[PDB]
Amino acid sequence: KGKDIIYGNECRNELLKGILTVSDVVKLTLGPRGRNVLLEKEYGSPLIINDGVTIAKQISLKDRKKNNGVKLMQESTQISNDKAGDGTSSTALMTATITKKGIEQVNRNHNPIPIQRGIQLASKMIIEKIKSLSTPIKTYKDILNIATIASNNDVHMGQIIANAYDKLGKNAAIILDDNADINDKLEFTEGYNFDRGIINPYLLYNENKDYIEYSQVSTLITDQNIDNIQSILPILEIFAKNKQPLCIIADDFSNEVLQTLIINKLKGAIKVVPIRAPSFGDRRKDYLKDLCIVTNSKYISADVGLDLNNLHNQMSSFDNNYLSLLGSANTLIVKKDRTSLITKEEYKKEIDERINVLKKEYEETTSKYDKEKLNERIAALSGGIAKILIGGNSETEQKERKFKYEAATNAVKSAIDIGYVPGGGVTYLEIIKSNFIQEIHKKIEEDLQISSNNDEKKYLELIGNLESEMELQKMGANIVVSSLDVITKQIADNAGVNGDNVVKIILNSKDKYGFGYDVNTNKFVNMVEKGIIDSTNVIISVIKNSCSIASMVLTTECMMVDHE
Amino acid sequence: GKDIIYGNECRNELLKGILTVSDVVKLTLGPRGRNVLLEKEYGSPLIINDGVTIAKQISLKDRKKNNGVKLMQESTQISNDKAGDGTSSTALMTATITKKGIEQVNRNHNPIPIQRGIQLASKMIIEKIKSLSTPIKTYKDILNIATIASNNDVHMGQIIANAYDKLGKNAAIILDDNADINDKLEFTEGYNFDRGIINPYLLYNENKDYIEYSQVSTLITDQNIDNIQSILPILEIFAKNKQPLCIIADDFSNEVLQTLIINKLKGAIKVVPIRAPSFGDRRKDYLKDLCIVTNSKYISADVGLDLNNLHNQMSSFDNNYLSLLGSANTLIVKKDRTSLITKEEYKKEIDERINVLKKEYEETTSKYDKEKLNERIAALSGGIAKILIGGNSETEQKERKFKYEAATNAVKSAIDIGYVPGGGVTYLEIIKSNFIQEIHKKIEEDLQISSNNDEKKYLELIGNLESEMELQKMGANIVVSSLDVITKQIADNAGVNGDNVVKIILNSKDKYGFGYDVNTNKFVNMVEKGIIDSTNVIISVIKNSCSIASMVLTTECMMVDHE
Ligand SMILES: Nc1ncnc2c1ncn2[C@@H]1O[C@H](COP(=O)(O)OP(=O)(O)OP(=O)(O)O)[C@@H](O)[C@H]1O
Ligand SMILES: Nc1ncnc2c1ncn2[C@@H]1O[C@H](COP(=O)(O)OP(=O)(O)OP(=O)(O)O)[C@@H](O)[C@H]1O
Ligand SMILES: [Mg+2]
Ligand SMILES: [Mg+2]
């Protein structure tokens, strides 16, 4: 055992070499007309792929030092974790460009702290500008276009997402399931979806699937906060002996009643999902009642006499059966913030009847607060869940398409939340052609003016040059700005056209916001008209990740590899 | 086969290892420290900013140079996972002083006078820092020391501050691992006396330096366990039960101090032998209180239950040996101040007992009895703070656990007479107030009271007097010249000229506590902006650095088993 330590410029240069390797291999696949990359498998078959994520997940350099940069970019972009969303391919290129431009300056006797400050400020200001340059999603064609673009121009899966959003609402919970066929079929099933998820993520340290999937679970819906573990202990023991999945929907969960026995034992012999009731006030009662009618769980609450702290005294109410007090559901899917449950085929009529009653109450009350509360309740009760059965020609193609669908759906969700901006890298070019660099310059100048003259003391002038601080801050800003034409230029270059000249045309022609070059038809058109649009969150995340990684590498001053 | 190396070569290689540790740790000094990349063979690289976490992984392939690294990893308790606050600064000061001293020793100089000067400078500086401390009075002071000693973590700092405000000026705090990511804070009724681990040998298995047992069975007595055959049935019963056992006796005779043997040789029986809390008759009363907090049948000859011959006539005990003991929720045995979390069942009994004691407080005039009874009631009541620490990973839990332990220990040392301006200005004060002349005067007097006392040429032929004095003051100068490294390194890591910051602080106007805040790039008052450190941390930093430097200077040989 022995470590090898390396500091300063050498460390930054090796990390930069790894980053540049990842970018040099990924930028070739940017755009729909990206080039192909051949990967030889020792299993005996070579694969020619054009997807940047698949190629990036296999890049690894023999140089243990340079490989650090590769691993760093594989983890910062969530590529190694198999959760890398859309835009990571562009993030690699932008990150490498910004990091190289910054490191070349830092290694030349410059100060990295002011450059990092300028990079971070430029990132924040550019994110605000991109937010101010976004447009909301209104028509269905917008959803179809964003889904197809975020799906590497896959019309089939794009249409699937579009139809999943049309037959459902703009808050539809879509579940991705594996299929045995070669086509991606779409189904719909009635269910309930609220706005609560997995409170303590440690519940996933057994199964590492980022979600919870339990089939035919028994529900225990209450209204109080489960504090005394000896209050629900008999039900817990019963389900621990039968080994059946259990879901508990309480209001809160005392500190010690969720760690001493729930999380540590589920990794032993018990299936429990502790979700909290979704509420903003007393409305919790109504939502819990709806959940108890959807699954027939016998609403537990002190208001209805059934107190969760003494269920042994009233043992002659629920017919002495601790299980007749519980409910049932087909499938339970608990995400980070949106629990979903598929209603059983038996209660279908009951809930339907309840829905009718609620409708009868909707046209019988005024003041707009009861009508809005009832409207939200009816919309939640009569909701649904879209099931996308994804398939492929191989076992690995299924997982690839699964990741593709996950990234596309996440992009569509971020697009229904925040707006959308024209694709093709024109959004990055707008901040360059509209002179936003002068705005960030003015911002750094004001931030330094409120600190230099304001502090009436020359104590800060000798510990550092003021003009040098301004020059370095604006230097970092210039570095972040000058590395925005790489996306569109690389996309056009991979298609076989002069990328730099395309950028020059887009920057010199003052057309509306969104004027770009379509590589599928090699023609200069309007992006928002032909449907080439991206979600604002994707672009914002791309620039934020690139700037954060660049600043982190600039701040890094030491490397340790266990080999000497 | 061994490889032996002496003198300057050995010292130079040890210094190279020490310098490696310092060069890798000083980059994280201060809140604006730089990042360090550590590659794990698992496949994931980690960007860390904590000096302790990075120092625990530095290891050189050079078996000889690696010795210095290991030396500093053990002297600062880093390898033992007991490194408190200030170790990051201790590394830098130790390396600077050690290099300055070795460079002088290697030039045919004498290391003994330099070592003497270093030790004297350390003692004098410690006394000066003690005289430069201020008492802690307001709660904001506790919050500030906790936040600063916690690597500027407002959450954990506030947790410690609230644990000390909502509790007494002792705050028995227990640190436990949690499954959540939000470090929660709880309070639980309990009993805390002034006894600890009478024999640290019980820690040769667990490297946690403390004892934490959940749902233990208590056996509280009043006599001295002299015959092991008096508790042998209970030990045999517990040999079958994999349940924790705690025995609170009065003296625990020499040979009955074998339970620790069965507990370590095979962990078959788990026994914690704590001693009586008081020195005298009050121990009986305290033991009775302990027997009321836990359902323990107080053993003593005055109440008839004698621990010797429990099979005598005219007794009640049915030889059962089991219901005679008590129970508790959790038992925490530290080096001192043992803690027991009261059970949710005996609570009312204790309340009643407390009330009875109060009835005796307003019924007696003897002030000594009212004081003893008041302390007893205060001990019965009270609470214990439980800090459930968590993280985003399994290793982050232990990392935050060590962080919380170091921060709480710093606050404990600060509640005593300890409070000093942060930012390394305390090290700069001994430089700005010409204290070097004070240490010079001390060595001059210590040598004058010895030079004119012999009145013969016996000491002048065995060594130059002026050279000896010059070397002693040389060691003192070495210790003094290495005090601006803390503030300079912090300012340098922040992106500003560190040396110029030190010159400004020393060449400032007439102020005392005036420093440079790197978080808001401004020269302000440390005591005003809450940037304060515990005097014990600074004292330990200087003492450890000087001790390690002197030890390295005295070393004259190295042996590595290789070639
Ligand atoms: N038909 C098109 N014409 C012009 N530009 C396009 C077209 N389709 C997509 N783009 C642009 O190409 C970019 C997407 O490139 P690509 O899909 O190769 O990688 P990515 O989306 O950045 O990351 P990932 O590979 O993970 O999806 C988008 O920013 C979009 O603006
Ligand atoms: N905001 C601040 N501005 C200037 N100096 C500070 C500030 N906060 C803390 N310091 C100084 O930095 C020192 C603490 O540095 P740091 O926390 O990096 O390592 P450490 O506390 O010496 O050891 P460890 O890393 O084990 O905690 C303290 O002595 C304190 O005086
Ligand atoms: Mg794509
Ligand atoms: Mg600290």
Residue numbers in the entry:
A (entry chain A): 68 to 631
B (entry chain G): 69 to 631
Paper text:
In both chaperone groups, each monomer is comprised of three domains: an equatorial domain, an intermediate domain, and an apical domain. The equatorial domains contain the ATP binding site, the intermediate domain serves as a hinge connecting the equatorial to the apical domain, and the apical domain is involved in substrate binding. The overall structure of PfCpn60 represents a typical group 1 chaperonin, with a sevenfold symmetrical cylinder consisting of two back-to-back stacked rings composed of seven subunits.
In order to understand its mechanism in P. falciparum, we report the first crystal structure of P. falciparum Cpn60 (PfCpn60) bound with ATP, which reveals the large conformational dynamic of the apical domain relative to the intermediate and equatorial domains. No crystals were grown from WT-PfCpn60 probably due to the structural heterogeneity caused by the fast hydrolysis of ATP in WT-PfCpn60 which occurs in the matter of seconds. Comparatively, it is estimated that the D474A mutation slows hydrolysis to a rate of around 40 min. One heptameric ring was found per asymmetric unit of the PfCpn60 structure. A second heptameric ring in an adjacent asymmetric unit that is related by twofold crystallographic symmetry results in a tetradecameric complex with the rings stacked back-to-back, as observed in the other Cpn60 structures. The seven subunits in the asymmetric unit are in slightly different conformations and differ from the closed and opened conformations typically observed for other Cpn60 molecules. The superimposition of the current structure with the closed and opened conformation of TtCpn60 (using the equatorial domain) confirmed that the conformation of the PfCpn60 structure is a unique ATP-induced conformation distinct from both the closed and open conformation. In the current structure, the apical domains of subunit B, C, and F are much more mobile (weak electron density and high-temperature factors) than those of subunit A, D, E, and G, due to less interaction with other symmetry-related molecules. One unique feature of PfCpn60 that impacts intra-ring subunit-subunit interactions is the extra 27 residue insertion (residues 513–539, α15–α16) that forms an extended α-helix loop and contacts the left-handed intra-ring subunit. The inter-ring subunit-subunit interface buried area of 683 Å2 in PfCpn60 is much larger than the buried area of ~ 200 Å2 in other Cpn60 structures, due to the extra 27 residue insertion in PfCpn60.
